């Protein structure tokens, strides 16, 4: 297929938000529903990041609902060919909310994604996330 910068951005926006949209009940379904956003190596790294962080443990323990909204528009920091595949480094700030009847906590995070073109044979979108990095401010 074909990819536009603007299309890739809107897509990166969706993927970033989806990653922070789950709860103590549906986490497994939501987790798995997102695998399509990722490339082979991206899925491994994303899963690894999930295990290292304690987030899922607190969400379950405190039985929270996680949501997020884009704080500013996503931007392409850099684009070009990496290892034979056209790629985009996309960054977007977000406001994440962890809440329940008893708790309400918010975080300003910045998501940085490496997005690469892949075969539509395995990923109909034609692109996938190879690296998913979260940080503050």
Author numbering: 71 to 207
What did the paper state?
The structure model of Form I (space group: P21212) was refined to a resolution of 2.2 Å with the working R and the free R factor of 19.1% and 23.5%, respectively, and Form II (space group: I432) to a resolution of 3.5 Å with the working R and the free R factor of 17.9% and 21.6%, respectively. DotIC is a single domain protein composed of four helices (α1 - α4) in one half and one β-sheet in the other half. Sh2 comprises βs, β1a, the C-terminal half of β2 and the N-terminal half of β3, and forms a large cleft with α3 and α4. The cleft of the molecule in the Form I crystal is filled by 2-methyl-2,4-pentanediol (MPD) molecules, which is included in the mother solution for the Form I crystal. This asymmetric unit contains eight DotIC molecules that form a head-to-head stack of two half rings composed of four monomers each. The crystallographic two-fold axis at the center of the half rings produces the two octameric rings.
DotI is a 23 kDa inner membrane protein essential for intracellular growth of L. pneumophila within mammalian and protozoan cells. DotI is conserved in all of the identified type IVB secretion systems, including the conjugation systems of R64 and related plasmids. Structural analysis of the periplasmic domains of DotI and its R64 ortholog TraM demonstrated that DotI and TraM are structural homologs of the T4ASS protein VirB8.
